[model samples]
Target chain A: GVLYVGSKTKEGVVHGVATVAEKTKEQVTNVGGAVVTGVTAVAQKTVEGAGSIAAATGFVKKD
Target chain B: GVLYVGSKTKEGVVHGVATVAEKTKEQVTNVGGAVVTGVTAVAQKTVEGAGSIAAATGFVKKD
Candidate 1:
């Protein structure tokens, strides 16, 4: 259940961080773009991780 | 096969959970990719030199 909760909140985390990145972009892509790049990796990895987690509990019974 | 072990029988939850989880991944991946896709574009159109000090920590006026 803890894992489920953690995975569930991934979307919220991405949105909040992205908001900051977008606001930051207006002032300085010099730094904000780095943040954007960083967020890209973080978001990608978080999703992939959750994707596998979904597979773990997914409907398919082929084990 | 291996699923006969019956660790978590709540397919009721995992079933719904996976749908959202997987969709969230696709959504996040797109959003994240959206930014980096523009990383170069944003970076090229940089600031008016007012962003140097703000990019780092212990400098920006925050509380």
Candidate 2:
């Protein structure tokens, strides 16, 4: 398969090792507003697109 | 002026009326890591660029 693994073939498979190995704890919270993460969005010519958007009444972090 | 204002021109210049209207308290902090904001960056072809990146030993909020 295209996205298949066989008994851990490539030990240097970056993609397969990353994303799952760690995380970007850098996150945002919307305190009564939208948390706009331009993210991987795009806007070319007259057409436009966004990666993600969010809003909240209040925001706080968890211990 | 393209990015100028005349004390007060249009009742609703929109662009001139917003941004300064308020603030997006939706911010992020990296607890011993980077706070990557994809932001308004551009990446195409073989070249690449990032909006911003930051790191911190710990993260907390203020009142």
Candidate 3:
């Protein structure tokens, strides 16, 4: 048995719990009109629980 | 099989996915700068998917 993770943002405020996921790199072709660095890491993970995640970081990137 | 990873940051808005990278300890020569603790886990890993990686910890440190 296991729990999953979830997060939420309240009108510019971010809050949530940490969980575990498989971190990996994926090549992105676009940033949806965002300025991303030349080289970056795309983190990944599996479901654990609602706010049951193991970690969090502002280093989190998206494309 | 091998996959590349990527990320994006909004205009003063940090948005999008969480993924893993190979976490290792590195000595800081300068902080562009930020004050990190004496020790930290540089969480990391290879490619998995769009939110398909595993594990995340804010305890990660960088130089």
Candidate 4:
């Protein structure tokens, strides 16, 4: 959510909740991205681990 | 596996996707929490850093 005021020609300054909101949004996005990346990596590793375990158990594959 | 029905007896927020997709659900949940927290903290520090980079440069930590 972004809030902005004033014109771009003159007296244009990031006022109201624009600056803080933008910064906060950016922070949240950055945090979220990192979170997703880390989570996905861990998830991938876990899935691979599970597969390896299953393979070690010599499970049968149906054709 | 986390869903809530709104009101005393009404609608639900997290609708659908109820069954156990895989065995790594719990593992993902645990890892997701840690990832979110770690990423959030890193993001906070990054924003704080953008504000002031001259605060710590010569190696010094004040209590």
Best by TM-score: 3
Give the native contact fraction of candidate 4. 0.02
Q: Which residue segments of model 4 deviate by more than 4 Å?
A: A1-63, B1-12, B15-29, B34-63
Best-fitting candidate, scored by DockQ: 3
For model 1, report the TM-score of its A chain: 0.15
- Candidate 1 yields a Cα-based lDDT of 0.21
**Residue lDDT tens for model 3, B23-62:** 3332111111111111111122222233332233232334
The residue-by-residue lDDT of candidate 3 on A1-63, one tens digit each, is 222222222323221112232333422111111111111212223232332322223343333
Candidate maximizing lDDT: 3
- Residues B1-63 of candidate 4: C-alpha lDDT, one tens digit per residue: 222212121221221111122222111111111132211111221222223111111211222
Weakest 10 consecutive residues of candidate 1 chain B by summed lDDT = B11-20
Candidate 3: list runs displaced more than 4 Å. A1-14, A18-63, B12-43, B46-63
How would you encode candidate 1's per-residue C-alpha lDDT over A1-63 as one tens digit per residue? 111111111221122232222212112111122233311222222222112111111122233
At residue B38, candidate 3 shows an lDDT of 12
The DockQ values of the predictions, listed in order, are 0.03, 0.04, 0.05, 0.03
Question: Would you list the rank order by lDDT, best first?
Answer: 3, 2, 1, 4
Residue A18 deviation, candidate 4, in Å? 34
* CA RMSD, predictions in order: 21.6, 20.7, 18.6, 23.3
Supply candidate 1's per-residue lDDT for A29: 15
What interface RMSD do all candidates show, one decimal each? 21.6, 20.7, 18.6, 23.3
**Model 1 C-alpha lDDT per residue in residues B1-63, reported as the tens digit of each score:** 011111221211110001122212112211211233211111221223223212221223232
